[PDB]
Write a protein that binds this DNA or RNA. Sequence first.
RNA 1: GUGGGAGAGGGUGGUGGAAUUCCCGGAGUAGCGGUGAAAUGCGCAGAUACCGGGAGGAACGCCGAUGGCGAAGGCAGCCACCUGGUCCACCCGUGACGCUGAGGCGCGAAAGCGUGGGGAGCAAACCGGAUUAGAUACCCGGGUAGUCCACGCCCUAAACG
RNA 2: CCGAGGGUAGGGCCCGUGACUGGGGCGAAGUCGUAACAAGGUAGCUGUACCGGAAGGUGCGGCUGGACAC
RNA 3: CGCGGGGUGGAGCAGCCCGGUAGCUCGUCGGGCUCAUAACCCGAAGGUCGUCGGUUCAAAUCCGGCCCCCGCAACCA
RNA 4: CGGGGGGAACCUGGGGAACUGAAACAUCUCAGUACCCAGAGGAGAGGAAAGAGAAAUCGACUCCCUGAGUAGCGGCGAGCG
RNA 5: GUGGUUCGUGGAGCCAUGGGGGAAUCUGGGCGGACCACCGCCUAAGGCUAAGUACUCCGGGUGACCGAUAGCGCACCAGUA
RNA 6: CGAGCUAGCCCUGGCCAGGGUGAAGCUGGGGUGAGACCCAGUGGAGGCCCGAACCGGUGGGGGAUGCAAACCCCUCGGAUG
RNA 7: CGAAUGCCGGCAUGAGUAACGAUAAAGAGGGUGAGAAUCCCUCUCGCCGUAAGCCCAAGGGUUCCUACGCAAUGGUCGUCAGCGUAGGGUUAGGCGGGACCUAAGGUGAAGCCGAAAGGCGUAGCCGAAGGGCAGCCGGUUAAUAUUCCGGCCCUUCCCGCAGGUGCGAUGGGGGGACGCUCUAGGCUAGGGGGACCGGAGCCAUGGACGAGCCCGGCCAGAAGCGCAGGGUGGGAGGUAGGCAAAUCCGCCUCCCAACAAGCUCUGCGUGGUGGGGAAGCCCGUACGGGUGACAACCCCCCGAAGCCAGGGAGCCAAGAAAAGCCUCUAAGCACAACCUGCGGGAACCCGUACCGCAAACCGACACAGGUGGGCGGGUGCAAGAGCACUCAGGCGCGCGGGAGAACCCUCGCCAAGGAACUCUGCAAGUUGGCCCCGUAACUUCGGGAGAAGGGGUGCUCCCUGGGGUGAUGAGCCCCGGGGAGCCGCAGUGAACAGGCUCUGGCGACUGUUUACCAAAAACACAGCUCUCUGCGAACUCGUAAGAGGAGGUAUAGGGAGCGACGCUUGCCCGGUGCCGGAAGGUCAAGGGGAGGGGUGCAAGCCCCGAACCGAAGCCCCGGUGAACGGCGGCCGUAACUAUAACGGUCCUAAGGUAGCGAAAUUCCUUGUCGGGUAAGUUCCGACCUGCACGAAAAGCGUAACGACCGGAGCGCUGUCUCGGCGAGGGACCCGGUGAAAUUGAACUGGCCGUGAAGAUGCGGCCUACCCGUGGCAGGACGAAAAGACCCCGUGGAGCUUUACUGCAGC
RNA 8: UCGAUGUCGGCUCGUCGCAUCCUGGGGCUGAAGAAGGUCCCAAGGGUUGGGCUGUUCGCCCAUUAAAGCGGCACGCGAGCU
Lengths: 273, 47
Amino acid sequence: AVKKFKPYTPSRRFMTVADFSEITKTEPEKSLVKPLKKTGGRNNQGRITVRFRGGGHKRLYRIIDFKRWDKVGIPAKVAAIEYDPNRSARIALLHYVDGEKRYIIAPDGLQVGQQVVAGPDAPIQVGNALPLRFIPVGTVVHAVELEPKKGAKLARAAGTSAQIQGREGDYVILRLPSGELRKVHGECYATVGAVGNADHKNIVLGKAGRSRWLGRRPHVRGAAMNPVDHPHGGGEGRAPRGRPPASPWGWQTKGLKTRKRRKPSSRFIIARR
Amino acid sequence: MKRTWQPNRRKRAKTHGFRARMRTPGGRKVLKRRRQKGRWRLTPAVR
RNA sequence: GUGGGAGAGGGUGGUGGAAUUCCCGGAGUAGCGGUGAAAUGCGCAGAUACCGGGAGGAACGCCGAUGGCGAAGGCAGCCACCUGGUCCACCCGUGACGCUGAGGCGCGAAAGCGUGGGGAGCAAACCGGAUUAGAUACCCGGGUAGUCCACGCCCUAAACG
RNA sequence: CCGAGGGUAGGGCCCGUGACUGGGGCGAAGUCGUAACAAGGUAGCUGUACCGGAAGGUGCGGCUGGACAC
RNA sequence: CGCGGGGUGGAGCAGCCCGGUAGCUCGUCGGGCUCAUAACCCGAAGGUCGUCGGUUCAAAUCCGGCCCCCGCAACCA
RNA sequence: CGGGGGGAACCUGGGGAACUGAAACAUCUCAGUACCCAGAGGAGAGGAAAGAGAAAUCGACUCCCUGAGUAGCGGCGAGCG
RNA sequence: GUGGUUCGUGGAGCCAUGGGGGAAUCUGGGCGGACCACCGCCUAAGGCUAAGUACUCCGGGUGACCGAUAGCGCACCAGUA
RNA sequence: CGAGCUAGCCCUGGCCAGGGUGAAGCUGGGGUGAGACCCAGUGGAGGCCCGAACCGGUGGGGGAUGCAAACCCCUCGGAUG
RNA sequence: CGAAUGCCGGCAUGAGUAACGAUAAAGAGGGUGAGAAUCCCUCUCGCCGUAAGCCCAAGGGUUCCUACGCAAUGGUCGUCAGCGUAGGGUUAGGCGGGACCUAAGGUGAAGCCGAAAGGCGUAGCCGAAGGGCAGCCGGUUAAUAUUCCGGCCCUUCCCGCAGGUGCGAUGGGGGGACGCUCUAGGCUAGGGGGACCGGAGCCAUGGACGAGCCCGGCCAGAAGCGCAGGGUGGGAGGUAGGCAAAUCCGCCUCCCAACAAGCUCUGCGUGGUGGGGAAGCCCGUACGGGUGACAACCCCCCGAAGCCAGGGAGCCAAGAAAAGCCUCUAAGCACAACCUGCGGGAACCCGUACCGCAAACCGACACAGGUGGGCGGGUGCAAGAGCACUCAGGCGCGCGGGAGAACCCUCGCCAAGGAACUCUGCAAGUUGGCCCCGUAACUUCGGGAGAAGGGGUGCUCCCUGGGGUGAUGAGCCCCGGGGAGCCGCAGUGAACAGGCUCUGGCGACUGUUUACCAAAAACACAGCUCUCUGCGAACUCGUAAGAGGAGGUAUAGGGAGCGACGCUUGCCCGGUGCCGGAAGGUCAAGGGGAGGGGUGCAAGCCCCGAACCGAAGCCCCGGUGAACGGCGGCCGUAACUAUAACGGUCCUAAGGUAGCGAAAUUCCUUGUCGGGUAAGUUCCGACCUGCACGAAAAGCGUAACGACCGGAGCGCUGUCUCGGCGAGGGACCCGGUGAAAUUGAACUGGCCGUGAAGAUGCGGCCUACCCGUGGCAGGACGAAAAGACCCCGUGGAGCUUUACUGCAGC
RNA sequence: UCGAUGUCGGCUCGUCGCAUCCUGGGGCUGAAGAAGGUCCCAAGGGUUGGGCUGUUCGCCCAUUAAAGCGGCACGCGAGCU
Ligand SMILES: [Mg+2]
Ligand SMILES: [Mg+2]
Ligand SMILES: [Mg+2]
Ligand SMILES: [Mg+2]
Ligand SMILES: [Mg+2]
Ligand SMILES: [Mg+2]
Ligand SMILES: [Mg+2]
Ligand SMILES: [Mg+2]
Ligand SMILES: [Mg+2]
Ligand SMILES: [Mg+2]
Ligand SMILES: [Mg+2]
Ligand SMILES: [Mg+2]
Ligand SMILES: [Mg+2]
Ligand SMILES: [Mg+2]
Ligand SMILES: [Mg+2]
Ligand SMILES: [Mg+2]
Ligand SMILES: [Mg+2]
Ligand SMILES: [Mg+2]
Ligand SMILES: [Mg+2]
Ligand SMILES: [Mg+2]
Ligand SMILES: [Mg+2]
Ligand SMILES: [Mg+2]
Ligand SMILES: [Mg+2]
Ligand SMILES: [Mg+2]
Ligand SMILES: [Mg+2]
Ligand SMILES: [Mg+2]
Ligand SMILES: [Mg+2]
Ligand SMILES: [Mg+2]
Ligand SMILES: [Mg+2]
Ligand SMILES: [Mg+2]
Ligand SMILES: [Mg+2]
Ligand SMILES: [Mg+2]
Ligand SMILES: [Mg+2]
Ligand SMILES: [Mg+2]
Ligand SMILES: [Mg+2]
Ligand SMILES: [Mg+2]
Ligand SMILES: [Mg+2]
Ligand SMILES: [Mg+2]
Ligand SMILES: [Mg+2]
Ligand SMILES: [Mg+2]
Ligand SMILES: [Mg+2]
Ligand SMILES: [Mg+2]
Ligand SMILES: [Mg+2]
Ligand SMILES: [Mg+2]
Ligand SMILES: [Mg+2]
Ligand SMILES: [Mg+2]
Ligand SMILES: [Mg+2]
Ligand SMILES: [Mg+2]
Ligand SMILES: [Mg+2]
Ligand SMILES: [Mg+2]
Ligand SMILES: [Mg+2]
Ligand SMILES: [Mg+2]
Ligand SMILES: [Mg+2]
Ligand SMILES: [Mg+2]
Ligand SMILES: [Mg+2]
Ligand SMILES: [Mg+2]
Ligand SMILES: [Mg+2]
Ligand SMILES: [Mg+2]
Ligand SMILES: [Mg+2]
Ligand SMILES: [Mg+2]
Ligand SMILES: [Mg+2]
Ligand SMILES: [Mg+2]
Ligand SMILES: [Mg+2]
Ligand SMILES: [Mg+2]
Ligand SMILES: [Mg+2]
Ligand SMILES: [Mg+2]
Ligand SMILES: [Mg+2]
Ligand SMILES: [Mg+2]
Ligand SMILES: [Mg+2]
Ligand SMILES: [Mg+2]
Ligand SMILES: [Mg+2]
Ligand SMILES: [Mg+2]
Ligand SMILES: [Mg+2]
Ligand SMILES: [Mg+2]
Ligand SMILES: [Mg+2]
Ligand SMILES: [Mg+2]
Ligand SMILES: [Mg+2]
Ligand SMILES: [Mg+2]
Ligand SMILES: [Mg+2]
Ligand SMILES: [Mg+2]
Ligand SMILES: [Mg+2]
Ligand SMILES: [Mg+2]
Ligand SMILES: [Mg+2]
Ligand SMILES: [Mg+2]
Ligand SMILES: [Mg+2]
Ligand SMILES: [Mg+2]
Ligand SMILES: [Mg+2]
Ligand SMILES: [Mg+2]
Ligand SMILES: [Mg+2]
Ligand SMILES: [Mg+2]
Ligand SMILES: [Mg+2]
Ligand SMILES: [Mg+2]
Ligand SMILES: [Mg+2]
Ligand SMILES: [Mg+2]
Ligand SMILES: [Mg+2]
Ligand SMILES: [Mg+2]
Ligand SMILES: [Mg+2]
Ligand SMILES: [Mg+2]
Ligand SMILES: [Mg+2]
Ligand SMILES: [Mg+2]
Ligand SMILES: [Mg+2]
Ligand SMILES: [Mg+2]
Ligand SMILES: [Mg+2]
Ligand SMILES: [Mg+2]
Ligand SMILES: [Mg+2]
Ligand SMILES: [Mg+2]
Ligand SMILES: [Mg+2]
Ligand SMILES: [Mg+2]
Ligand SMILES: [Mg+2]
Ligand SMILES: [Mg+2]
Ligand SMILES: [Mg+2]
Ligand SMILES: [Mg+2]
Ligand SMILES: [Mg+2]
Ligand SMILES: [Mg+2]
Ligand SMILES: [Mg+2]
Ligand SMILES: [Mg+2]
Ligand SMILES: [Mg+2]
Ligand SMILES: [Mg+2]
Ligand SMILES: [Mg+2]
Ligand SMILES: [Mg+2]
Ligand SMILES: [Mg+2]
Ligand SMILES: [Mg+2]
Ligand SMILES: [Mg+2]
Ligand SMILES: [Mg+2]
Ligand SMILES: [Mg+2]
Ligand SMILES: [Mg+2]
Ligand SMILES: [Mg+2]
Ligand SMILES: [Mg+2]
Ligand SMILES: [Mg+2]
Ligand SMILES: [Mg+2]
Ligand SMILES: [Mg+2]
Ligand SMILES: [Mg+2]
Ligand SMILES: [Mg+2]
Ligand SMILES: [Mg+2]
Ligand SMILES: [Mg+2]
Ligand SMILES: [Mg+2]
Ligand SMILES: [Mg+2]
Ligand SMILES: [Mg+2]
Ligand SMILES: [Mg+2]
Ligand SMILES: [Mg+2]
Ligand SMILES: [Mg+2]
Ligand SMILES: [Mg+2]
Ligand SMILES: [Mg+2]
Ligand SMILES: [Mg+2]
Ligand SMILES: [Mg+2]
Ligand SMILES: [Mg+2]
Ligand SMILES: [Mg+2]
Ligand SMILES: [Mg+2]
Ligand SMILES: [Mg+2]
Ligand SMILES: [Mg+2]
Ligand SMILES: [Mg+2]
Ligand SMILES: [Mg+2]
Ligand SMILES: [Mg+2]
Ligand SMILES: [Mg+2]
Ligand SMILES: [Mg+2]
Ligand SMILES: [Mg+2]
Ligand SMILES: [Mg+2]
Ligand SMILES: [Mg+2]
Ligand SMILES: [Mg+2]
Ligand SMILES: [Mg+2]
Ligand SMILES: [Mg+2]
Ligand SMILES: [Mg+2]
């Protein structure tokens, strides 16, 4: 867990690296990779629409399987566990017995020797995937479809998960990583277990450059600009915010709630305290 | 010290070229103007 | 050695019910809290009291003792796994192989510390109400850390027989 | 060659001393309060933690060297 | 020099704006409870309102001069 | 069979500023101007009354003169008309 | 809700129409400046239509137009160097 | 009309003499009840060190109708990020 | 026209003045010619040599070669040239690109969107310094050559013959196909040496006829073979996956090899063959040609960063695509087709001169600037692409000759002193490489460290150790050890190499910045906190479609502040912001029609219109501080005095906690005291009276780090006392060429006055023959810039907000 | 004087005034002497080095015969900082 370093430089002092011993394979499965954009944070207009992105290691995109149900009931063996550098978590390689190979987000505890299956059939066991309706209540689970057949949007990040708090009608109540309580349709596939590589959160970048490697460019504060640039710009040397703190585009950035009021999605949410 | 003119033959025809001018309505009126003026060259001549 | 026994001894994983709290539904009205007496607080925006549903955390009533276990600190709902000490009966083996123990090593309540989780009740600090000459207290209404878990430190004590 | 010493340089220990600063001891009749000794008028003491003009207070846990009515 | 606010029983504050009437806490004094003291209880006393003009019938109150006090300001140079 | 693209200016349509004026300026003005776009053509537009507007009146449209800087419009201001 | 007209919300009709409602076929319908009556005018929701009009790349004619710093930027190998 | 200067990003290539320091890990030996750990060798990490190329532009002098509309000299910063 | 810093043009002044563009440097002889410092040839001298040499790409576009020229261009001259005229000159199946592939991006049948113009968009297409692809050595021209020629190799297409096979694709699968750092083995490039091989010739000036000196001792090459490496299992059964179908690939099982065994591919070697082939001498060359020669053509050593190459290990930040190629089958055809070998034929377009770190490209210039890839030899110094000298090659920078003043620049040295200089050791000095000894506080245990401070350093002889290569040997090459001696002032003998310590502030650190007056204490930064965001996310761009976010999903993403780490981060929710609140108040359009009005004879048509229902917003109720923010006044009091733990009272939403404090903050201020100094407005340590510190516009500390800013010491010095001398490049003189701002005109003195108040120009007096050269700056309110400061203008622009008004957005 | 009269201080170079800091010459003295005080004449010359601060001033150290005050665009930036 979380390799450290003696301080033979500054910043090798506090730097901290993942423990990679979970990883059984280095080259990824060539059949299953695609290239990346990458965007520099710019949209089709050439315009930066997300600030302070660029640089960063070249990356191959592992295509990964968020619909488990097209393969219902066909088991598969866990061949390898490897590094996906597009995501916080790790990818498991699955040889199916069709002979089809796919990548899955690797739940915490999944071993590579083992067998996994998806469908209502499906023993309730780490790595298996089921309609939410057939998971026993209280199970912790990840990679959840938000609507049926639409793919897994929820609890995919290293160490995340969700619990089933109960059922009502065609819907079941989940506690998301956020802690929002919301209804998800029972027909939505989820895959039992937590995500893991949960040690992820204790990495300590340790020096500026390591932030660059991840494609994050420097972030300059409103305080450091001039009034043209930012509601916090200007003053003579340093300065409180002088107004309720804002984004460069001018909206308040402390407490102001941005979620649209009237979304139909509101009928299906109960929480987030 | 590096100055502003760094000639490159492809940059010129990709930029001020005749097919450049014809692709954009802005650029067609460039030609239209230069033709109505009697310009001998309607477009940089790059070799 | 062999055959037996008692036990909250320890570590792990589960699990049950009672209660408090919060939320939803129902029903229902004008007060509920609280004290020496009060006030702050809470309540017609529907409180308290009552019934039903749900979430979550902590602690385990009766058994329970003037009891048991551990070297000490300490250890208490129930279940399983792993594991320490210890006593008894037979008189079977080894043959003084013992006792203590400067240093060393380990364990060491509470509180405190670090990184994470968790956070129901309680509650330093803090605010308010009251008392008072004052009241940076004692009583009352709030309330953060903490109390719980994991790993790691700290290593003190009326650590008392 | 070695060599009394001399010189240059960098350490160690010890003594004296120093604006000021920490507490401590002591000092016939100073100021503020009452913490403790009698249920000391909130039993006390206690390791620790936070607070507070001051003694001390409160939290958690511990010790008894505290306990004829309702 | 500037602009704004103030000066009232021993202390600290009201009242002045809107003229007539000076109030609150503390202190002080007389008495009480107590062995005594304080606390506490019952009573009292104590003032021309910085000053000097003016206005009015009447001035702490309005107007002016002076005197103090506090605050703000003194930039480009 | 046809279209496409070009054409000094002129024409119709779609869109459409500001300096400026108002001795400041927002309504207003400049101005439906400048400009951009689309279409025409040798012209274009318009055109044969669900019109005028006070006479029992005129009689499609376009252009000139006049009506007239009138009727009016107008931070009833500048000014527009 | 707006645009057009002289009409800037005005007593604001007329003409046009982005939105909502939504008829009738001569005893129907539009208009004459809110509106009502009366008296008149006119027949919307299809289309085309010469000429009188504008312009000047081009050709001609003519100047109390210039005459090489003028007159077109160019009298000249100029939208050139 | 401009990103042939410059700023960022994207795709694809290239460049960084030489020397110095000596992380983790590995191996052996020690150590222990098993550990922790200790030492040695090995190893060869790093917005590590010195220093060319390359990238800079610290201080000073010179230049100042310049060699130059930002240059020259000396000095100096980075030089596997 | 007389004025507008007017406009266009012409010509003046400055003035024969500055300058003639790197201080790498020249001298002579001969030739040519009307004419020669400047053109050509020779000799001598100097400069570059990780270049200032050579090759390639851009860009440039005939500048290339040659003949004839010198008006102009050339910073002088020109007989020369990149200049004028003319003629010539660029040769490809294999090199580069195109009749190949795809990347970003671009474009775009489908489709989506937008008043119009247009925007987007799957596939496809386009797009290259990336992938794919078959030429090596030499000779030849004045000028091109992997292009022509010679020699030896190879590719594709078409056709044919033969042999083989279920042939066949834009479809399936494999492959292509990948990072960074370190790196093994074997090669090659390149290099050093040889007593061996080959060669004109030399014995100078004292010595040397020598195992002397000087020069050279290679290159390309199919198959075959050799060495070194890369790639890679084979067989069968089953099969539901690879959007049809496969016998292929995937997967499961079984069966042999376990190995490069083999098969295969590449590198190097060798190879039939072909080709080069020095010095020197002669002639004769802008250039090179005879001979040397029938040249030799060999050993050893050093050795890549290059090759074998898809090698190996380690690491985390996790490292293109498509085609060629292989395989699999589908239609379809199985006379076809395809595979293999041989043979014949066919094989297009474009570039190809020349410059190319620069006089030919970008900088108006033959401009000290800028410009990507490759090669870049030798010796010495620890290494090296550093430094000095030097090969090859290339240059002496397109004005010169003299003189030997001031002065300037760049440089050398200095008695004694040693920072006294000065805002400041600014500047210059000192130090300086390697090896060895040694090395503090403090520390985050790495560091601090090159701390500091020292010693060594050459040459000769003797002895001796280990390595790589060979054999285990010599030879050669590498790393050392010990002993005795020699010379000088000095041995990193030249050149390239830190001055050091103490101690504060600020910033943790490396980084970033105002191109061109600021590199910093600013920005960034890892890290901490708040906050929004359930995913068609929030947020951003866009009218929209669409895109970014993200092919991400709360351990994520966005916004904000704070800024490693340590210890910490108090009180106030009155106001403002945000967050919650199903009541209440108010509230627009709309609903509602009480009543009222216009006009009709009237049915009616039309206009007002009270109650009441009626959102968000605001009000109202709460909460909220790593949200905007804000965190008291007067008076009294202790048995010297002083002060005030204590008290009183007024006010507040609450009255600044810890820590720190005359500070990057302190006015008074050079506060007071202490320390450093002979002397300290700075500095360090203290105190607290903090004008006007204070806790994430964070508080207080912190090892390490810094071209940051302060203070002190040592060392050392031309900074200074205080100046002197010397060098060179200028300045001066002569020959050639020859600018500039400025300029009302000038016949342009001093004092005391006067004057619009600072007079060459007016008054008075004084002084004063005409004209220059080199010099200095006191004045011509000198030049330059229609003053940036200041005000004015109902001038402008950027910025702000609880200014007005409006718009997007919500 | 705004179609420009560059500002503190320092350095360099001075020059002048005298209301004289020193030296020279004087009068008075509450001048014994030596040494002072005070006023008068006198502008020939002279008038230190250093610590602090940007300073001018000023304070301080060590001396001195003395450590003079002013003017010259608070002399002097086409002379330097
Ligand atoms: Mg675009
Ligand atoms: Mg970030
Ligand atoms: Mg930032
Ligand atoms: Mg700024
Ligand atoms: Mg703004
Ligand atoms: Mg601000
Ligand atoms: Mg600022
Ligand atoms: Mg400020
Ligand atoms: Mg560059
Ligand atoms: Mg190109
Ligand atoms: Mg032509
Ligand atoms: Mg024992
Ligand atoms: Mg403990
Ligand atoms: Mg505890
Ligand atoms: Mg009490
Ligand atoms: Mg007590
Ligand atoms: Mg007690
Ligand atoms: Mg007591
Ligand atoms: Mg307390
Ligand atoms: Mg100002
Ligand atoms: Mg129109
Ligand atoms: Mg105006
Ligand atoms: Mg005006
Ligand atoms: Mg204006
Ligand atoms: Mg108009
Ligand atoms: Mg129009
Ligand atoms: Mg006609
Ligand atoms: Mg017509
Ligand atoms: Mg006509
Ligand atoms: Mg028509
Ligand atoms: Mg209208
Ligand atoms: Mg109006
Ligand atoms: Mg109207
Ligand atoms: Mg009408
Ligand atoms: Mg009708
Ligand atoms: Mg109508
Ligand atoms: Mg009408
Ligand atoms: Mg009418
Ligand atoms: Mg009509
Ligand atoms: Mg009709
Ligand atoms: Mg004539
Ligand atoms: Mg002429
Ligand atoms: Mg002309
Ligand atoms: Mg003429
Ligand atoms: Mg002309
Ligand atoms: Mg660019
Ligand atoms: Mg760019
Ligand atoms: Mg290296
Ligand atoms: Mg290294
Ligand atoms: Mg480095
Ligand atoms: Mg370096
Ligand atoms: Mg510089
Ligand atoms: Mg300079
Ligand atoms: Mg100068
Ligand atoms: Mg990089
Ligand atoms: Mg005139
Ligand atoms: Mg002028
Ligand atoms: Mg003139
Ligand atoms: Mg002349
Ligand atoms: Mg002259
Ligand atoms: Mg001269
Ligand atoms: Mg000269
Ligand atoms: Mg020259
Ligand atoms: Mg020459
Ligand atoms: Mg060399
Ligand atoms: Mg000539
Ligand atoms: Mg020239
Ligand atoms: Mg050929
Ligand atoms: Mg060929
Ligand atoms: Mg080709
Ligand atoms: Mg073809
Ligand atoms: Mg293509
Ligand atoms: Mg293509
Ligand atoms: Mg497009
Ligand atoms: Mg389109
Ligand atoms: Mg292509
Ligand atoms: Mg290519
Ligand atoms: Mg290529
Ligand atoms: Mg090729
Ligand atoms: Mg050749
Ligand atoms: Mg086949
Ligand atoms: Mg590639
Ligand atoms: Mg070779
Ligand atoms: Mg001889
Ligand atoms: Mg070797
Ligand atoms: Mg590899
Ligand atoms: Mg790495
Ligand atoms: Mg393709
Ligand atoms: Mg068939
Ligand atoms: Mg060629
Ligand atoms: Mg050249
Ligand atoms: Mg260069
Ligand atoms: Mg080059
Ligand atoms: Mg030249
Ligand atoms: Mg040049
Ligand atoms: Mg370069
Ligand atoms: Mg060296
Ligand atoms: Mg040389
Ligand atoms: Mg030569
Ligand atoms: Mg000498
Ligand atoms: Mg000297
Ligand atoms: Mg000295
Ligand atoms: Mg200093
Ligand atoms: Mg210096
Ligand atoms: Mg020390
Ligand atoms: Mg040393
Ligand atoms: Mg020697
Ligand atoms: Mg040396
Ligand atoms: Mg040196
Ligand atoms: Mg050095
Ligand atoms: Mg300081
Ligand atoms: Mg910094
Ligand atoms: Mg660095
Ligand atoms: Mg910055
Ligand atoms: Mg700058
Ligand atoms: Mg600038
Ligand atoms: Mg600039
Ligand atoms: Mg810097
Ligand atoms: Mg932090
Ligand atoms: Mg938008
Ligand atoms: Mg995406
Ligand atoms: Mg900051
Ligand atoms: Mg508040
Ligand atoms: Mg609030
Ligand atoms: Mg509130
Ligand atoms: Mg009614
Ligand atoms: Mg409402
Ligand atoms: Mg705070
Ligand atoms: Mg406090
Ligand atoms: Mg202080
Ligand atoms: Mg001080
Ligand atoms: Mg302050
Ligand atoms: Mg200072
Ligand atoms: Mg201090
Ligand atoms: Mg502060
Ligand atoms: Mg703050
Ligand atoms: Mg500090
Ligand atoms: Mg520090
Ligand atoms: Mg730095
Ligand atoms: Mg720095
Ligand atoms: Mg000197
Ligand atoms: Mg000289
Ligand atoms: Mg004269
Ligand atoms: Mg005068
Ligand atoms: Mg005269
Ligand atoms: Mg002068
Ligand atoms: Mg001037
Ligand atoms: Mg005004
Ligand atoms: Mg204005
Ligand atoms: Mg002026
Ligand atoms: Mg002016
Ligand atoms: Mg001065
Ligand atoms: Mg006198
Ligand atoms: Mg005497
Ligand atoms: Mg004198
Ligand atoms: Mg004098
Ligand atoms: Mg100083
Ligand atoms: Mg002073
Ligand atoms: Mg001057
Ligand atoms: Mg100056
Ligand atoms: Mg001057
Ligand atoms: Mg002057």
